[PDB]
Design a protein around this ligand. Sequence first.
Ligand SMILES: Cc1noc(C)c1C(=O)NCCC1=CCCCC1
Ligand SMILES: Cc1noc(C)c1C(=O)NCCC1=CCCCC1
Lengths: 268, 269
Amino acid sequence: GSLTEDGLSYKEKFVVRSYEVGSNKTATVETIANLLQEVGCNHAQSVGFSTDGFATTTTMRKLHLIWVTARMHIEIYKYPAWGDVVEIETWCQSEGRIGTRRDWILKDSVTGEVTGRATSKWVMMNQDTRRLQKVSDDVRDEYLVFCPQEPRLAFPEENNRSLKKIPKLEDPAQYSMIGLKPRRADLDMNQHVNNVTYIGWVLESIPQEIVDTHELQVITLDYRRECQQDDVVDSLTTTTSDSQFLHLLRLSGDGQEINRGTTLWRKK
Amino acid sequence: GSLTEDGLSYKEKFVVRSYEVGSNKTATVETIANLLQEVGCNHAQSVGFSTDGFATTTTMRKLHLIWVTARMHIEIYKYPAWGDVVEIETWCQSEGRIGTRRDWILKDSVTGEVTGRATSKWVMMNQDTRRLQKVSDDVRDEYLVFCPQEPRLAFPEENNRSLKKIPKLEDPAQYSMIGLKPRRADLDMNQHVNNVTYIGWVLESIPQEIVDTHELQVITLDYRRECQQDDVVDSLTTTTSNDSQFLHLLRLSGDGQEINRGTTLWRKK
Ligand SMILES: Cc1noc(C)c1C(=O)NCCC1=CCCCC1
Ligand SMILES: Cc1noc(C)c1C(=O)NCCC1=CCCCC1
């Protein structure tokens, strides 16, 4: 992997591993999501930001400020097979005082064809109080020198799937998976649950028949609250429709929301 | 990755990924175990065996026979850091009519120093009845051409940890983690739970204080029964011991049917 010629984006190649594939002999969506966070981390390191998952600058660390994912949107046209070479390109951009955006383009290295794309919105917050801040001015300058100044959107379409409001699932849910817990493998260097684990938890309430007759095409997820090491999650799914579903992750007892999303599935 | 000059072993290099590390900023044991299974699969493919996790030959598929892990033994001296390059060498060997053995050597590519080693015993079995059978001569000849004919042991020692009998944990267990379930990410191409998930489940009943003051040095695990997609596991641990040793047991949540038993040796950090 390396920053491109202009230094305003990063590229990296991956060979799909034997343990990274599911029932269709193709990469799981959790493998794809892990590959996205890997190239995003390598881009953060190549420009001097932190590599702890928060992509902080010098002044952000001085003020105990971090970047947190608020929303994610992934669209996959073709899942890579075992042994395939995928090329991922990533870049970040300023969204005024609202926050940051990180985009990804996935391509098959042999054909150069776009096989997937992703977008994510990030917000600035105090690491201890968790209170959101509007992006100041001294922070915008420390990281805008690494962003293209002209807009560069992985999903350029005027008001598309990545910018639609997600509603709260109403009880009773059609499908559910209860008592989900993260294990040590799901935790990062600072013992926080990996962002990709929440994707897997959402998909656990999808029935096995849908998974065996359909492929996941689009996934939009809102991150409301962080799940701790000792927290237990309930995964809820209801059909809204191709096949579409509405999702909800909440804490096992009290029912405190952690995530809500939508999935669009295509027949095999 | 590629088979070595003599074709009797396989090597592959890996760069440790950001999401593959834990609290120490070093690779988790599940990442190490996944890297071992990856190079083992690439070696199976390089010599024409199946790549479904069973490493079957033509005649084995004709008779519905598969290789299954019976025991695993891993020793780690130094866990690789984020961005480090590790080199893994693997080879398999005939253990007469008992089964096969697969060995691994982990090295830091920059220093060439041995940072870890692993061994595993495999047994032949009918895929459907799950009945273990002695390895026949037809099968023995189809894979012996890929094994070194002289012994090559990752753990050559005359009385080492990889060949010690593991006892069954007696209730009450000192520590426990209940209601563990595999997710879709933990399943292979044929919807079987990945062998590395069982390692992670064993380590879930280790207290967080041990994990934060010690590093895992040795892990020996016996695989008695396969956990299904819809099965729920209970993880049990009791201290047996500068070092700390534990006895482990994985069993089904209800009835308590054993799936695994093992031992871990931890060194002060
Ligand atoms: C920048 C940066 N610095 O460290 C990391 C790690 C990144 C990064 O790109 N993380 C993406 C997080 C994510 C991926 C897939 C699921 C939804 C959330
Ligand atoms: C040969 C072969 N062919 O496909 C695969 C996959 C292998 C392989 O080496 N699997 C190792 C299994 C394992 C890994 C970590 C500890 C527990 C047991």
